[PDB]
Amino acid sequence: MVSARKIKDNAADWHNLILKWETLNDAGFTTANNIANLKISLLNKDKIELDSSSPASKENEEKVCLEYNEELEKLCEELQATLDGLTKIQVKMEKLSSTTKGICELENYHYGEESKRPPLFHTWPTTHFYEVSHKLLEMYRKELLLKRTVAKELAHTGDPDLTLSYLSMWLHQPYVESDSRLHLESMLLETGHRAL
Amino acid sequence: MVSARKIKDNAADWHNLILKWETLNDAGFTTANNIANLKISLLNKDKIELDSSSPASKENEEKVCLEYNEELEKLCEELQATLDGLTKIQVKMEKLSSTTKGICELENYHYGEESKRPPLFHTWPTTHFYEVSHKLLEMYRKELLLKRTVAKELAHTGDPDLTLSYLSMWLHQPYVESDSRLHLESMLLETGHRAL
Amino acid sequence: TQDRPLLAVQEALKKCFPVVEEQQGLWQSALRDCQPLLSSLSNLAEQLQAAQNLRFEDVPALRAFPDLKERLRRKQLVAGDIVLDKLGERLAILLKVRDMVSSHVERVFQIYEQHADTVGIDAVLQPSAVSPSVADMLEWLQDIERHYRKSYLKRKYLLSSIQWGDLANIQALPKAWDRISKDEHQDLVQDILLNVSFFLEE
Amino acid sequence: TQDRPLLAVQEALKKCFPVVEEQQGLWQSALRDCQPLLSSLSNLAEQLQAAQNLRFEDVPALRAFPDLKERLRRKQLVAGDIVLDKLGERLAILLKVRDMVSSHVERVFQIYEQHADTVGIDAVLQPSAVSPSVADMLEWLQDIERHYRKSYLKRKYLLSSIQWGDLANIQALPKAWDRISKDEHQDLVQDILLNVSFFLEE
Numbered sequence: 001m002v003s004a005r006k007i008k009d010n011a012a013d014w015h016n017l018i019l020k021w022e023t024l025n026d027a028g029f030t031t032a033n034n035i036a037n038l039k040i041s042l043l044n045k046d047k048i049e050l051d052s053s054s055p056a057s058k059e060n061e062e063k064v065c066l067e068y069n070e071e072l073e074k075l076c077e078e079l080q081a082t083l084d085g086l087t088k089i090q091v092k093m094e095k096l097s098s099t100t101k102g103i104c105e106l107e108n109y110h111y112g113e114e115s116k117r118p119p120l121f122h123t124w125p126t127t128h129f130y131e132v133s134h135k136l137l138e139m140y141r142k143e144l145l146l147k148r149t150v151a152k153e154l155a156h157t158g159d160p161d162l163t164l165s166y167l168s169m170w171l172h173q174p175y176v177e178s179d180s181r182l183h184l185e186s187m188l189l190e191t192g193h194r195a196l
Numbered sequence: 197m198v199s200a201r202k203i204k205d206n207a208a209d210w211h212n213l214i215l216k217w218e219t220l221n222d223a224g225f226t227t228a229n230n231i232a233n234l235k236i237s238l239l240n241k242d243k244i245e246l247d248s249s250s251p252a253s254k255e256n257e258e259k260v261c262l263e264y265n266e267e268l269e270k271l272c273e274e275l276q277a278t279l280d281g282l283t284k285i286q287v288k289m290e291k292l293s294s295t296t297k298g299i300c301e302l303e304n305y306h307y308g309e310e311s312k313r314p315p316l317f318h319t320w321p322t323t324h325f326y327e328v329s330h331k332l333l334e335m336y337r338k339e340l341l342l343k344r345t346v347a348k349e350l351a352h353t354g355d356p357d358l359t360l361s362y363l364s365m366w367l368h369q370p371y372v373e374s375d376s377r378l379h380l381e382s383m384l385l386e387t388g389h390r391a392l
Numbered sequence: 393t394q395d396r397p398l399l400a401v402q403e404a405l406k407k408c409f410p411v412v413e414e415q416q417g418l419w420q421s422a423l424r425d426c427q428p429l430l431s432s433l434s435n436l437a438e439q440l441q442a443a444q445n446l447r448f449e450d451v452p453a454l455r456a457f458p459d460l461k462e463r464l465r466r467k468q469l470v471a472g473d474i475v476l477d478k479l480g481e482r483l484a485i486l487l488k489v490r491d492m493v494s495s496h497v498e499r500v501f502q503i504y505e506q507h508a509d510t511v512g513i514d515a516v517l518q519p520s521a522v523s524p525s526v527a528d529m530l531e532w533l534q535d536i537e538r539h540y541r542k543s544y545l546k547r548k549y550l551l552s553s554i555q556w557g558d559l560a561n562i563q564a565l566p567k568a569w570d571r572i573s574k575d576e577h578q579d580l581v582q583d584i585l586l587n588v589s590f591f592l593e594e
Numbered sequence: 595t596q597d598r599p600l601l602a603v604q605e606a607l608k609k610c611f612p613v614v615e616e617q618q619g620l621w622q623s624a625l626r627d628c629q630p631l632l633s634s635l636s637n638l639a640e641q642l643q644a645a646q647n648l649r650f651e652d653v654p655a656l657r658a659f660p661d662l663k664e665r666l667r668r669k670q671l672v673a674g675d676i677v678l679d680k681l682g683e684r685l686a687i688l689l690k691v692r693d694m695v696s697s698h699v700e701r702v703f704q705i706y707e708q709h710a711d712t713v714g715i716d717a718v719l720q721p722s723a724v725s726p727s728v729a730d731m732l733e734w735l736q737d738i739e740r741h742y743r744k745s746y747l748k749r750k751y752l753l754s755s756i757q758w759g760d761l762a763n764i765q766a767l768p769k770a771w772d773r774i775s776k777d778e779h780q781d782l783v784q785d786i787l788l789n790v791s792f793f794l795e796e
Contacts, residue, residue, distance in 0.1 A: 161442035168439040
């Protein structure tokens with residue numbers, strides 16, 4: 001009953017953490033888009049330095065490069081703050097999958113070894129809550145590791161088609177399958193959160 | 197970008213129309229030269245008529261005066277057909293100078309009035325494409341009006357030294373200064389037709 | 393008939409223009425939803441094109457990332473069909489607005505044709521101090537019925553360019569979409585409802 | 595080298611809009627000639643009205659010549675028919691402007707109906723960078739043809755209602771005449787000729 005309430009409690013926290021992930025991802029996409037506009041504005045200024053090639057654009061190359069650096073490191077720290085925010089979510093997500101992970105370990109043990117399985121709610125056995133908690137966790141573990149790589153390489157790259165694809169992966173997150181919203185509803189309707 | 201393609205298009209059409217002018221000028225010089233030789237051939241035959249016997253009336257004079265006139269009117273229509281051809285070219289010249297004129301009309305607003313004008317290609321502002329289209333137009337506009345006057349007076353005149361000077365002006369064309377060939381290359385090398 | 397055979401027409405107009413006022417509110421609330429939808433169509437078009445250009449790439453960062461090039465493409469198309477389905481919902485709103493006005497105006501014109509020979513040609517053309525003439529009331533409803541029907545055709549045909557799949561064409565969708573609005577009579581439905589604002593509250 | 599059946603329609607429009615500009619010049623120069631003429635009509639209406647109010651009264655000083663009311667009125671009515679004859683000349687100008695646009699546009703529409711099945715439904719709707727779509731070109735000429743015919747009706751009906759007596763109506767003629775313009779779309783023809791001003795010079 002306490003393990004049953006914690007399954008319902010984890011099911012609720014899984015929904016809240018997903019909303020926190022997509023919300024922080026929106027603020028991160030704004031920072032990343034500003035990084036892209038900073039790379040494009042620097043390339044645009046590089047053409048202006050080649051047009052007004054007087055002995056005053058080679059000085060403004062140093063002025064613009066310093067404003068570019070100070071804003072780039074500020075956006076890198078802002079984007080790293082978004083990474084840390086998504087990492088705290090991922091830590092809580094691993095904590096939700098590991099907390100559930102203990103429940104069935106002692107639930108199948110309390111009654112010997114396979115004698116009869118009591119349903120925690122109306123139908124879903126305790127094992128089925130793992131297949132959702134593990135798939136949801138592995139999806140965001142891959143997504144977090146990808147978003148880290150995109151954050152590092154976005155500032156280093158200069159290719160336009162690569163910058164667009166970098167922003168593309170960040171906006172719509174790939175590793176989180178589209179069916180993840182349905183698997184969440186299949187568990188929220190089971191635990192009693194979603195209205196009957 | 198759209199201003200760049202239409203400027204390059206005008207640079208090509210400006211070159212093509214010049215070639216049509218010099219070709220029609222050759223056919224026009226052939227027609228005009230035939231008129232000059234026709235005036236001289238009649239004078240030479242008039243000297244032969246004075247070397248003829250006194251007991252001779254205008255037997256061949258009536259035949260020659262009609263064939264000479266009919267051929268003169270035929271050559272006047274042939275030369276006028278060349279004039280009309282060069283006039284259609286000059287109309288297209290005015291269409292090229294007003295089209296370029298409109299390109300800079302929207303170029304001066306895009307960059308306010310306090311910022312430098314970025315060159316449409318490598319070393320040419322949009323305003324400079326107008327100053328060439330206007331001077332080139334003024335040259336052939338003057339030349340067209342002269343070719344009209346020379347064509348009208350060539351058939352009317354009988355002065356030998358005046359006829360020779362008439363052919364000289366159609367041949368070299370005075371109003372078309374020698375610098376027209378260099379300004380044409382300065383357009384094509386910029387727009388990307390001629391290799392820099 | 394009534395004590396005045398024109399009262400049946402004035403009552404039809406007093407009920408028709410407030411309906412046109414509601415339909416213009418839905419017509420504009422749908423066109424505003426289409427500005428970011430077409431912007432997201434041009435946005436996904438740029439992403440899809442750049443991603444397809446980079447099928448030959450060998451990024452060192454792309455290591456230990458399986459099916460990433462494959463999933464991104466599928467994920468872009470899913471988000472694209474969502475924008476297309478929402479645009480189809482907005483066309484349904486614009487079509488419903490068109491069918492509403494094209495039906496109310498036809499019903500008001502049927503009421504007019506019942507008493508066309510009995511009201512008199514002088515009562516229709518005669519305006520009041522604050523209400524325009526009943527003839528201009530009907531003719532303005534004819535211009536409104538034209539504005540919605542003539543715009544809905546261009547709205548659907550221009551939004552059929554998605555069938556070409558041309559990444560360059562769908563990138564200029566918001567550029568040509570805003571052209572349909574500015575080229576039409578943008579200040580027409582709100583301006584006709586202004587001259588009749590005195591006739592409604594009688 | 596180019597689309598042939600579209601050049602016949604493009605040349606028809608390049609020759610039609612300059613005609614609309616000329617007809618608008620006479621149309622506006624005629625409505626301006628009606629502003630002081632109707633003002634003098636309201637003046638003569640006030641004189642005839644005040645004289646008619648005091649045609650049955652008997653002021654002792656004017657009793658010395660009792661044949662004064664007859665002469666004064668005849669002189670007032672003569673100046674009234676002079677204004678009416680000049681106003682009829684301006685209606686002839688507005689009639690000529692209406693007949694020229696309603697006939698030339700029909701001729702341009704004959705050229706369009708010759709190639710309606712050959713140009714293609716896609717070529718008409720497609721606009722240029724500075725020239726509107728050929729569909730908007732024709733529909734705007736229909737709106738101008740409507741504007742002149744719908745205004746000529748109000749100009750002619752209002753200038754024929756003055757003959758039906760009513761001493762008060764001819765005193766309020768400039769009030770309802772200036773209403774004809776303000777109630778319609780006065781700034782309509784000048785805006786259509788503005789969007790097509792780029793199409794005329796090639």
